[PDB]
Design a protein around this ligand. Structure first.
Ligand code: HEM
Ligand SMILES: c1ccc(-c2ncc[nH]2)cc1
Ligand SMILES: [Mg+2]
Length: 379
């Protein structure tokens, strides 16, 4: 059945049950609802993410809207700085965890994760960490505008308010640093090219970008490590394993699930010929589960020889969770080091971590996916 819908409740309840069938039967799957093709095969996807002259993306300055080489520049402003934020990402985790020790339990997504990911992004932007609640809130409100297929008139209103709220918060902070630079990212954005309203739309995009996926990765890892208790023990003993666990969780259950692209000319991918101006969706989950790229692909295995940690976190990595080529996630380097730091602390701090009694595990999200909650218990 090619008639099946990939925006359907049924798809969303468990996408990994259906990818297999999309590849090998309807790889360039047309969705009759939007005017968009969903591409599910690894090589078909990777070629698209390789060449953004044919499959153009949306640039790193314009608004993340209703859904050239500052990359270089931003890349090193993360890269050079990620070793200055190492003690702060470190304190963030420790500070945020302290409430939940002794109680002996926590929900790593609701009690801990969302709030941690936000505080990191805030140190990277140099905003005042006291305001983390305001921000997580507004940050979701816009995240929604983007993630959602459609919205209620209440939500759409609320999302618009959040952007309004976000703008009027950041913008004075932009001018303050344009004239008195700090040593944060916003501070650098205003040094040696860019205008005020442009620097805002960039900050807004980095905020959206560094925040949501970080959350989800740490949680997906903890969950897949506790679900293979013997691999969890593997990580507990030799900590150098953390990155592979990060990586394999990335291939396994990629936080960002779809990558879109606009189509320049008329071009063929797979068996199907497409047409101009059309948005096609890369199905990352589907690609990281293609036998063609990974053997035993539906097995969480941190020790898999076909992962390749040497490059799991670069422009030319095996999995497509960070995208591919010259448009790969700008903070890949940063993503590694951030998640690494928490994971390590979590393990250090929640001795004898286990899943809570009667913990029923569930995931949510079409564009970006992750656990609704992860209920863990500890000493
Ligand atoms: C859990 C780790 C992360 C994952 C899996 C991830 C994944 C991705 C993916 C798949 C893309 C789209 C590639 C494309 O279509 O061009 C992307 C874009 C991007 N990422 Fe990440 N990312 C992560 C963490 C981060 C962090 C920590 C930062 C900032 C330090 C960051 C900054 C960006 C930026 C600026 C973009 C460009 C998209 C835009 O224009 O808004 N990412 N990321
Ligand atoms: C909502 C939140 C974040 C994203 C995103 N796109 C690339 C990296 N992160 C997309 C939608
Ligand atoms: Mg973060």
């Amino acid at each position: 059945i090619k008639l099946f819908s990939v925006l359907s409740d049924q798809f969303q309840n468990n996408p990994y049950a259906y990818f297999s069938q999309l590849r090998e039967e309807d790889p360039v799957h047309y969705e009759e609802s939007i005017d968009s093709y969903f591409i599910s095969r690894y090589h078909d996807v990777r070629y698209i993410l390789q060449h953004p002259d044919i499959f153009t993306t949306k640039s790193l300055v314009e608004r993340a809207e209703p859904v050239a080489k500052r990359r270089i520049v931003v890349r090193s402003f993360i890269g050079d700085a990620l070793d200055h934020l190492s003690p702060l990402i470190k304190q963030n985790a420790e500070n945020l965890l302290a409430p939940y020790l002794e109680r002996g339990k926590s929900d790593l997504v609701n009690d801990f994760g969302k709030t941690f990911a936000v505080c990191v992004t805030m140190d990277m932007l140099g905003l005042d960490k006291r305001d983390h609640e305001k921000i997580s809130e507004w940050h979701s409100g816009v995240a929604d505008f983007i993630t959602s297929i459609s919205q209620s008139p209440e939500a759409r209103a609320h999302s618009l308010w959040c952007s309004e709220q976000l703008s009027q918060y950041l913008m004075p902070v932009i001018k303050e640093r344009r004239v008195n630079p700090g040593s944060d990212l916003i501070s650098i954005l205003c040094t040696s090219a860019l205008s005020d309203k442009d620097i805002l739309a960039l900050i807004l995009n980095v905020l959206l970008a560094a925040t949501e996926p970080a959350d989800k990765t740490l949680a997906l890892m903890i969950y897949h490590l506790l679900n293979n208790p013997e691999q969890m023990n593997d990580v507990l003993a030799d900590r150098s394993l953390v990155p592979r666990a990060i990586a394999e969780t990335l291939r396994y259950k990629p936080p960002v699930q779809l990558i879109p692209r606009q189509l320049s000319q008329d071009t063929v991918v797979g068996g199907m010929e497409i047409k101009k101006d059309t948005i096609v969706f890369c199905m990352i989950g589907a690609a990281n589960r293609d036998p063609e790229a990974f053997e035993q692909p539906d097995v969480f295995n941190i020790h898999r020889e076909d992962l390749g940690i040497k490059s799991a976190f670069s422009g030319a990595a095996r999995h497509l969770a960070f995208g591919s080529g010259i448009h790969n996630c700008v903070g890949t380097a940063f993503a590694k080091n951030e998640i690494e730091i928490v994971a390590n602390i979590v393990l250090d701090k929640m001795r004898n971590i286990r899943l809570e009694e009667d913990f029923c595990y569930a995931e949510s999200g079409l564009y970006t996916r992750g656990p609704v909650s992860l209920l863990v218990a500890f000493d």
